Assembly symmetry: C3
Homo-oligomer: 302 residues x 3
């Protein structure tokens, strides 16, 4: 009946420890859905619907072949039901039916992680687009039996497009705007739920010489990302999050509800900024993050 393991799920930029076991296990994951008002941008508030308090949800890391047992709780203060659809799960709605949880209630269910990959998980309660648009999406990494190559640093990044009634910058609590959502005209396109979530004081950090791996998800609802890191090149790209590996790519497409894994070695100090290369989203809508690399200067490289 498999060894029991309490999963270590991480809040985002952080990734759980690499899997140091070579046998299947039942991994217990606890998830709670809570609705809360937070800052989208300076002076701009939004009513986010979250998985564990923020956007994206906590990253789950398991091994191919594991049984994932989820204890799904919908906070008592929630105003609507919530559930979870794991793209990593095979079967009815990816777990949506089994995890339909009204406020103040807890659901439990398990699924076997049959295939390795970087999968998006999100709420699938009607209206599906609204539950996703309000921030209910995260990533679950299903490692191959053999595991992934060691890397110096790992980051959890999820892009998403938000639809605000007021336009970008309008002060105050901004409601979700269904019409802009349907027309695919977001006001904010950000990494990890807020403008600046991965910038300024919250910038990611690495040291010169380190090999960096970024687990990049795209919660959508609607946009497709042309992911790029200014100042660097992708040594490796797990195309669309699958087994296929591309090399020397400057910018990759991350499908809606899809992902990608990028790896690059940062050999020289400086500030590298992650962006959706559909450029105006980055410099006008918030799809901008920073990777600060400390260390010492090599004039030969630049």
């Amino acid at each position: 009946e498999l060894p029991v393991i309490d999963a270590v799920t991480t809040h985002a930029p952080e990734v759980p420890p690499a899997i140091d076991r070579d046998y299947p296990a039942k991994v217990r994951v606890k998830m709670e859905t809570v609705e809360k008002t937070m800052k989208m941008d300076d002076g701009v508030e939004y009513r986010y619907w979250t998985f564990d308090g923020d956007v994206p949800g906590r990253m789950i890391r398991v091994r191919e072949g594991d049984t994932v047992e989820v204890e799904f709780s919908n906070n008592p203060s929630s105003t609507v039901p919530h559930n979870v659809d794991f793209h990593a799960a095979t079967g009815q709605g990816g777990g949506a039916a089994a995890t339909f949880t009204a406020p103040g209630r807890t659901s439990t269910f398990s699924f076997k992680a049959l295939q390795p990959g970087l999968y998006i998980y999100h709420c699938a309660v009607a209206p599906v687009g609204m539950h996703i648009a309000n921030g209910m999406y995260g990533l679950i990494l299903v490692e191959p039996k053999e595991g992934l190559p060691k890397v110096d640093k790992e980051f959890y990044i999820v892009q998403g497009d938000f639809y605000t009634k007021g336009k970008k910058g309008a002060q105050g609590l901004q409601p979700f705007d269904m019409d802009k959502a349907v027309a695919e005209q977001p006001e904010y396109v950000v990494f990890n739920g807020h403008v600046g979530a991965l910038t300024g004081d919250n910038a990611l950090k690495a040291k010169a010489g380190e090999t960096v791996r970024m687990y990049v998800g795209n919660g959508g609802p609607n946009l497709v990302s042309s992911f790029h890191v200014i100042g660097e090149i992708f040594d490796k790209v797990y195309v669309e999050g699958g087994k296929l590996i591309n090399e020397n790519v400057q910018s990759t497409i991350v499908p809606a509800g899809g992902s990608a894994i990028v790896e690059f070695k940062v050999d020289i100090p400086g500030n590298y900024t992650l962006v959706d290369h559909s450029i105006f989203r980055a410099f006008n809508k918030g799809a901008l993050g920073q990777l600060k690399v400390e260390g010492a200067e090599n004039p030969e490289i630049m």
Copy 2:
């Protein structure tokens, strides 16, 4: 001088029989273009321009090296000329020049299927975007000499974006809207020409344990699909319809005027819904289909 064979072209969800011959042949295909009003959605009618009566056109299945002889007929009642551009054909407009057919006339021409792959074919009469937008696109599968691996079930799925004058839901006969087409703002995004074409009573059917292959095309005119099947994972993906094969992909990009071949084994009963994961298209514009899988329950999977 090559044996002559009358091809079997199927209406959509269905795929023609796998090629059971290991020698080149001249495959005779008969195509007719007919304009007709049909139901886009409940109470919503649209004037479709079709290849053989519906959207998409009939799927053609040939073998690499075959000579495809097309007898192209434009129905007497058509109001405009029609032709066909096969992405599988090498040469002037992919056959567009040779197949320019006025109403009540018949054209004939042949081309050699030089390269294996899943190719889109569509009308290319000016204005090209309008002819495509009204539904004139289908898929031609060109099998490799050695043929494709046996599979239990095969489905013909083609996504397309439609531009209606009224907004989604507006009752009555809705005219094509050029302005929305140019701005890439469709009202309907559907699989196989109509909302629900592959859902409800028209849902695709398979049995638990069967390996399923879906020939997925994207007629456009403008959108790019983040194809995904809720509840399942792609075991194999012929990237962009070519020779390259990816594995364990949750969601793939299907280029405009492009395709993809996805294969997955359905091991547990239930309802799986195909969607464009640019989510609002699926739950708000119609890009939603269903694969009903009967059989017996495996709790170990979920």
Copy 3:
């Protein structure tokens, strides 16, 4: 120390000579940024911001391991600063910081081309989107140590979306429109800076039987291209400009700020038109180019 070779850069359709050396070198490149008014379309003028007088900039061709020394000059008549971010360069802004050049000034800096590939380079002065949108982008091809396979013809093609205040066709000098840029609603989508740049008398030329390679870039700012050549099929596609090679692809995605290398043999005479298969961009917004192939007819093909 390394040898010093002056680089041979080319204006677009043309590609520099293949690298005929098997040792590292310091390649001197001279670039000048000049702002000038040119014809976007018949009767339509636009104030382009360019790298060396046109869009795209001159193509640079170097070898993996080379040190690229850039003498960057901002023409005295320019009204704003300009710099360059090479996606091929590893380090601070891809050279943006070191190349920030006010009008009438010259900057110099060097970087080591560590990785092979087809890279986009563009201006990164605030506001970044505007500098890119006005035409400041080009390609730098970094050949692998071993070099790329010989081909009969090579073409330099870069797609880009332009945001005009007036709508497509509006006569006169059309100003950049920030609002359309942010909403990702371009008026013109073209290959090589202007409508018709690669068509009519400016059509690309090849002879029947020749193997053709196209270095395709996508300067954006915002669109993603579903690159396709009507009448032909891609024998090889360097996926997203990386090492990975796909085959028998009808249409590939070229990411914003990304690229692709496509190779195909043109075996039969005729006119082949390159397009963004998000069709309305091609036939309504200008994303249309032509490849005129000379030679002699083969009815066995079509």
